[PDB]
Design a protein around this ligand. Structure first.
Ligand SMILES: Cc1cc2c(cc1C)N(C[C@H](O)[C@H](O)[C@H](O)COP(=O)(O)OP(=O)(O)OC[C@H]1O[C@@H](n3cnc4c(N)ncnc43)[C@H](O)[C@@H]1O)c1[nH]c(=O)[nH]c(=O)c1N2
Ligand SMILES: *[C@@H]1O[C@H](CO)[C@@H](O[C@@H]2O[C@H](CO)[C@@H](O)[C@H](O)[C@H]2NC(C)=O)[C@H](O)[C@H]1NC(C)=O
Ligand SMILES: *[C@@H]1O[C@H](CO)[C@@H](O)[C@H](O)[C@H]1NC(C)=O
Ligand SMILES: *[C@@H]1O[C@H](CO)[C@@H](O)[C@H](O)[C@H]1NC(C)=O
Ligand SMILES: *[C@@H]1O[C@H](CO)[C@@H](O)[C@H](O)[C@H]1NC(C)=O
Ligand SMILES: O=[N+]([O-])c1ccc(O)cc1
Ligand SMILES: O=[N+]([O-])c1ccc(O)cc1
Ligand SMILES: [Mg+2]
Ligand SMILES: [Mg+2]
Ligand SMILES: [Mg+2]
Ligand code: NA
Length: 584
């Protein structure tokens, strides 16, 4: 027996296991599908970034009805440290109203102010050098960045010169410098904080900051390369799990917990454990012959991600060096790698293909002449039109509440809906942070080795195309501003200056948008049960005792930001919630 068993050793699972094992009377077993990383350069060194080393194999979407019925490979981590081990290290909090909105959906104790102590606890910020801060326009508010917590973050110690042209261009088209994008608003441009340990300029992933750091503890146990295949119950009490080798060896083992089972298996993993365990929609469980322990139609509903668009460019006068110099100039690449190996300086401190600065914008900043028109269309349309026909009414009610919160965010000048980035080379990136579309993740069988059916339903809500087209147009403004025109950019096929109407631009976007940046969330949502929720405000699964969801399956909806910083902080908070209930 262990005190706690955690299914998934990703960001949430390892953060929780670390904090729970601070009490030597508490024992934890973390069961993780993937192996330990080997500290290979493709993980530790930003410039060597090789995320495909630990992608979960054999996951494909359904044909995407909103994206010309395209099928895409599904990307999620399978490795100790989860997404933190293979992500692009972008470390950003959401905006105040994200957390305040989660609270307003019926979740006492959720707000920006309740999260801020956990953001601070989570991390240690290391300031950049003064000369890079001054030259780069790096700013921060030290009063709201942690100085003593486990997650290291800082910045690269270098910037490609064309990042300057893009900064000035973004300013020219109404994206001003943001003092600190961690202070609960991020309207304009800023340096991307990176989850790097500045001692060695290497990745600070959860395997290091929430396992290696505390791995002398005998009460903190890890079992890599095993899958949690089922939750075990005595009546409605979660008492243990079954696990199998990830490789599918014909062996099953049962292990038991004296206090709780925690699911931390991610947006695409947690709902599958619940559904195989008979916690999920009666209709699906009945079809597969799985006994219903708790009839929760929200399990596998409400899937969200943050779609991405790569816009290709050619330049008549780009500045050298730039990120594509690493790929197209072997001499430059070898000299920057030798520079990093010697004094830990230069381009290898930046995640490969990224630049150092980024822009975020509200709907009114993206669409200053038309945002009210997009809000009017969204307010006019029935919430239920966004969901499959015959969606459970409780799930529709939760989606209606989310939608009302997001339409308030659309009117809010201080909440982001999209991002613009330029890596300094042949492509730009435009992310959609706040889709109104909702997808599904459902098991197809009782075989725990079978991939679930993953249907992002990207672009099924027509409002999303209007928001995304506005983001595309703002990106075009940056590239046509004086500071960027000096580099001689032009959109490459299948984009181009001759695509001038919304219709022309979005027909190409429909063919190129990726449903996912591997930010899958919200498939075991924290909302009232009568709003299609799966977990309470204490993250307890409805209808059963001793069972919580820790991973970002529990989020109601996506942030103005990428998920990692909040995945850590929310696990920091859940550790304290659990310790208080037991008296640990
Ligand atoms: C390639 C790539 C790139 C990015 C990102 C992800 C990825 C994959 N993200 C997203 C971010 O990393 C992600 O949202 C968080 O890691 C989510 O943390 P969780 O704890 O929810 O799941 P996470 O995915 O971290 O952990 C879930 C774990 O559960 C395991 N698991 C699944 N099913 C299991 C089962 N049945 N039994 C046992 N273990 C099981 C998995 O193997 C995995 O390690 C990101 N975010 C960000 O803010 N900045 C960024 O730069 C990026 N970029
Ligand atoms: C990563 O963050 C941790 C946590 O603050 C830092 O660990 C500290 O390291 C210093 C010097 O090595 C020690 O004197 C402290 O006692 C450690 N503090 C704690 C709270 O453990 C580590 O320094 C960070 N990395 C950087 C570059 O600052
Ligand atoms: C996608 O597939 C369905 C039938 O499988 C079809 O009716 C629909 O027209 C297709 N969508 C597009 C945009 O081609
Ligand atoms: C920093 O901002 C100043 C003032 O707007 C500008 O002149 C400069 O080019 C910027 N540099 C970078 C690297 O963004
Ligand atoms: C290639 O990189 C080297 C090393 O910085 C540089 O001197 C050279 O001019 C670059 N060549 C081209 C063609 O970019
Ligand atoms: O290669 N990558 O960094 C990726 C690829 C796909 C994805 O959805 C997220 C990140
Ligand atoms: O700047 N931001 O808020 C971001 C940055 C990256 C990302 O994937 C999502 C949001
Ligand atoms: Mg210093
Ligand atoms: Mg300045
Ligand atoms: Mg200027
Ligand atoms: Na330096």
């Amino acid at each position: 027996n262990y005190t706690f068993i955690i299914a998934g050793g990703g960001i949430s699972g390892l953060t929780l296991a670390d904090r729970l094992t601070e009490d030597p009377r508490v024992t934890v077993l973390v069961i993780e599908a993937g192996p330990l990383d080997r500290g290979e350069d493709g993980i530790l060194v930003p410039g060597a970034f090789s995320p495909w080393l630990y992608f979960w194999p054999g996951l494909v979407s359904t044909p995407q009805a909103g994206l010309n019925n395209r099928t895409v490979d599904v990307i999620t981590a399978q490795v100790v440290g989860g997404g933190s081990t293979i992500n692009a290290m972008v470390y950003l909090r959401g905006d105040k109203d994200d957390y305040d909105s989660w609270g307003a959906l019926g979740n006492p104790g959720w707000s920006w102010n309740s999260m801020l102590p956990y953001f601070i606890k989570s991390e240690t910020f290391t300031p950049p050098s003064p000369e890079l801060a001054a030259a780069g326009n790096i700013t921060w508010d030290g009063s709201i960045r942690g100085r003593s917590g486990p997650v290291n973050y800082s910045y690269p110690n270098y910037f490609f010169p064309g990042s300057e042209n893009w900064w000035n261009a973004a300013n020219e088209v109404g994206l001003p410098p943001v003092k600190d994008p961690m202070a609960g608003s991020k309207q304009g441009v800023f340096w991307i904080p990176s989850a790097i340990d500045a001692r060695t300029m290497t990745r600070s992933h959860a395997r290091r900051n929430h396992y290696d750091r505390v791995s002398s503890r005998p009460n903190y146990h890890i079992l890599p390369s095993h899958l949690v295949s089922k939750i075990l119950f005595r009546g409605k009490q979660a008492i243990g799990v079954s696990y199998i080798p990830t490789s599918g060896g014909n062996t099953t083992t049962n292990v038991y917990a004296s206090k709780e089972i925690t699911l931390a298996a991610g947006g695409l993993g947690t709902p599958k454990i619940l559904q195989l365990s008979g916690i999920g929609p009666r209709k699906l469980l009945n079809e597969l012959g799985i006994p219903v322990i708790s009839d929760l139609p929200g399990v596998g509903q409400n899937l969200q991600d943050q779609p991405t668009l790569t816009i290709p460019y050619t330049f008549t006068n780009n500045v050298f060096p730039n990120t594509d110099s690493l790929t197209t100039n072997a001499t430059y690449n070898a000299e920057q790698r030798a520079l990093y190996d010697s004094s830990k300086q230069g381009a290898y401190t930046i995640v490969n293909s990224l630049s150092t600065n980024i822009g975020v914008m509200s709907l009114q900043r993206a669409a200053p002449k038309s945002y009210r028109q997009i809000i009017a269309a969204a307010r006019a349309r029935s919430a239920s039109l966004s969901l499959p026909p015959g969606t459970d009414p409780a799930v529709i009610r939760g989606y209606q509440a989310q939608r009302n919160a997001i339409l308030k965010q659309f009117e809010n000048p201080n909440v982001g809906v999209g991002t613009v980035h330029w890596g300094t080379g042949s492509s730009a990136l435009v992310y959609h942070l706040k889709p109104l579309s909702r997808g599904t993740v459902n098991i197809r069988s009782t075989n725990p080795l079978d991939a679930p059916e993953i249907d992002y339903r990207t672009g099924t809500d027509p409002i999303d195309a209007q928001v995304y087209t506005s983001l595309f147009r703002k990106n075009r403004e940056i590239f046509n501003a004086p500071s960027m025109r000096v580099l001689g950019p032009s959109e490459a096929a299948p984009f181009g200056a001759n695509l001038t109407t919304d219709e022309e631009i979005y027909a190409v976007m429909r063919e190129l948008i990726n449903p996912s940046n591997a930010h899958q969330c919200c498939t075991a949502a924290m909302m009232p049960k009568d709003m299609g929720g799966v977990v309470s405000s204490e993250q307890k699964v409805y209808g059963v005792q001793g069972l919580r969801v820790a991973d970002i399956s529990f989020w109601p909806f996506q942030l103005s930001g990428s998920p990692m910083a909040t995945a850590y902080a929310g696990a920091e908070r859940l550790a304290d919630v659990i310790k208080k209930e037991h008296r640990l």
